[PDB]
C-alpha cells in the first residue's frame, strides 16, 4: 500500500517565506527518495527540490538554490520543504512523490534520470501576491 499527502501551501505576500509537509502512509520515508513538483495551469511540472535515502544530501533547481531548502522527519514520517525569498513567479500547485531507492539501481546527482515517481498525490496550493 501507498499513499502521500501535501499540506502548508498558502498564500503570501512577495518577499515572504513558506513551509511544506509531504507526509506519507503504508511504506517509510527511510527507503525511499522524496520530490517537490510544481503545476502552473495548463504547464509542465517543475523538480524543486529531493532528498533520498542518505538524509546527508539533497537536490535543489538553479530557480531556488540559496532561498529553498529540503529536509525529512522519519519518526513524523514527512518531508518538509522551507521556502524564502518568494516571487510572484513562485505561485503554483505543490505536488510530491516518492521512488523505492533502496531497492532501485544507482541514483545519478540529478532530476532527470530514465526512472520515475507517478505515485499517489493531492497536492497544495501556493500564492505569492501582496
Known amino acids: 500500500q501507498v499513499q502521500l499527502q501535501e499540506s502548508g501551501g498558502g498564500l503570501v505576500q512577495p518577499g515572504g517565506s513558506l513551509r511544506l509537509s509531504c507526509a506519507a502512509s503504508?511504506?517509510?520515508?527511510?527507503?525511499?527518495?522524496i520530490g517537490w513538483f510544481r503545476q502552473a495551469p495548463g504547464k509542465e511540472r517543475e523538480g524543486v527540490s529531493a532528498?533520498?535515502?542518505?538524509?546527508?544530501?539533497?537536490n535543489y533547481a538553479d530557480s531556488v538554490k540559496g532561498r529553498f531548502t529540503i529536509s525529512r522527519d522519519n519518526a513524523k514520517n514527512t518531508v518538509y520543504l522551507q521556502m524564502n525569498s518568494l516571487k510572484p513567479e513562485d505561485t503554483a500547485v505543490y505536488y510530491c512523490?516518492?521512488?523505492?531507492?533502496?531497492?532501485?539501481?544507482?541514483?545519478?546527482?540529478?532530476?532527470?534520470?530514465?526512472?520515475?515517481?507517478?505515485?499517489w498525490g493531492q497536492g497544495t496550493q501556493v500564492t505569492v501576491s501582496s
Open positions: 503504508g511504506f517509510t520515508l527511510d527507503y525511499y527518495a
Open positions: 532528498i533520498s535515502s542518505s538524509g546527508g544530501s539533497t
Open positions: 512523490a516518492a521512488v523505492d531507492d533502496v531497492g532501485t539501481t544507482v541514483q545519478a546527482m540529478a532530476v532527470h534520470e530514465p526512472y520515475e515517481y507517478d505515485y
